[PDB]
């Protein structure tokens, strides 16, 4: 009767996996060392192919066929590592579990995929992204002192 | 009543006792915001509590404005300070003194500053803590317009 869509916001976080280098313990230092940057070999068709492979490997044949009907990456840029994937409201939990089960990129290792906000509209997703970006600047300004 | 923090540094203070906090404010927070060494100012400090008499405080204040020498070329500044619920009585005493002094066709020049103490208390659950903030108002009143004190962080009134 009405096509119900639901977008998922996900972020790529790189943990400082280095035991030979000691790290500073605070809020903004770990926020900066976790939000450093995404590598150059990052694209939309390269992340969609990887998540499709992971979904087909973890769920199966029908589990990937039911979710791959409306599985698209609407907006994503490698500068901040925030992407918005479109999916249905029935298979949203399956897409979240697939994002959780994302092991690694074909060339880049040691990364975590974190789903932050999920909703059925893009306007509220953009509003929450702007709110999160504004909140990020506060700890930065406070720690620069 | 777990701890007192100022300038992200833990201090040994008590909110219920006024003497210790007033002496701490007189000795630490004021010299770090105003320097009386490289200027020509004569600063008279005064802390206001809620148990002090308003008329007696005004009788202290109208005298503290004409105690220093006039031959030395001194700008005489009075630093009134308080914290917590005593700020209401502090403001009342300041406004009554202003009303009593401006009547003689004079002007009172004032600079205000607002900072905060950070205290911690036990929250609703045993695994949660609450962070309370206690305001601190510092006013500098003087009869002269120009003061060589570093008062850029204040507000002109």
């Amino acid at each position: 009767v009405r096509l119900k869509s639901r977008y998922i916001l996900f972020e790529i976080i790189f943990p400082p996996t280095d035991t030979n280098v000691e790290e500073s313990v605070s809020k903004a230092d770990i926020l900066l060392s976790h939000h450093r940057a995404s590598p150059a070999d990052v694209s939309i068709k390269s992340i969609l192919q990887e998540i499709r492979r992971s979904l087909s490997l973890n769920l199966g044949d029908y589990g990937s066929a039911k979710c791959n009907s409306l599985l698209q990456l609407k907006y994503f840029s490698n500068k901040t590592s925030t992407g918005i994937i479109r999916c249905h409201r029935e298979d949203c939990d399956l897409v979240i579990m697939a994002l959780m089960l994302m092991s690694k990129i074909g060339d880049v290792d040691g990364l975590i995929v974190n789903p932050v906000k999920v909703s059925g509209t893009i306007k509220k997703i953009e509003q929450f992204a702007m709110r999160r970006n504004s909140k990020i600047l506060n700890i930065i300004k406070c720690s620069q002192s | 009543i777990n701890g007192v923090y100022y300038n992200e540094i833990s201090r040994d203070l008590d909110i219920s006792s006024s003497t210790q906090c007033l002496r701490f404010l007189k000795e630490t927070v004021i010299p770090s915001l105003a320097n009386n060494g490289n200027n020509s100012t004569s600063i008279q400090y005064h802390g206001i509590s809620k148990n002090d008499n308003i008329k007696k405080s005004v009788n202290k204040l109208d005298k503290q404005i004409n105690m220093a020498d006039r031959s030395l070329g001194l700008q005489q500044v009075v630093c009134i300070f308080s914290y917590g619920p005593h700020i209401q009585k502090m403001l009342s005493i300041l406004e009554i003194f202003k009303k009593g002094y401006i009547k003689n066709n004079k002007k009172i020049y004032q600079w205000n500053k607002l900072t905060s103490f950070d205290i911690k208390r036990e929250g609703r659950n045993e695994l949660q803590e609450e962070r309370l903030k206690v305001p601190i108002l510092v006013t500098l009143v003087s009869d002269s317009e120009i003061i060589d004190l570093n008062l850029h962080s204040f507000t002109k009134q």
Partner: protein
């Protein structure tokens, strides 16, 4: 009667009086009972009162938008008002079987 906790009133509501044996439970609920998580706790068993506790009826019950709670306009008996040593009072709907707690204030009209 103003609702001091979770609940929504309606017109033609019943006004019951708090009993004497279950007097500390409502006082603790009005003071506060939280979960180990931190949020409030309303998921408990309700001490259903007796029947002979009707003291009033709410005529104009609508969610008060000026304070953020449920305002109840009722009319209680003076004898039962002097009977209780507290200002706590229970509100119930006509179809709902739940009892909300609140406090009433006298209006000089």
């Amino acid at each position: 009667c103003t609702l001091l906790e979770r609940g929504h009133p309606k017109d033609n509501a019943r006004i019951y009086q708090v009993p004497e044996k279950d007097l500390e439970h409502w006082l603790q609920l009005a003071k506060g009972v939280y979960r180990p998580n931190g949020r409030k706790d309303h998921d408990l068993k309700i001490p259903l009162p007796e029947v002979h506790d009707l003291i009033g009826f709410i005529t104009s019950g609508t969610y008060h938008l000026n304070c953020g709670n449920g305002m109840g306009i009722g009319f209680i008996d003076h004898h039962a008002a002097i009977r209780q040593p507290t200002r706590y009072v229970l509100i119930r709907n006509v179809g709902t079987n739940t009892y909300r707690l609140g406090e009433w204030s006298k209006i000089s009209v």
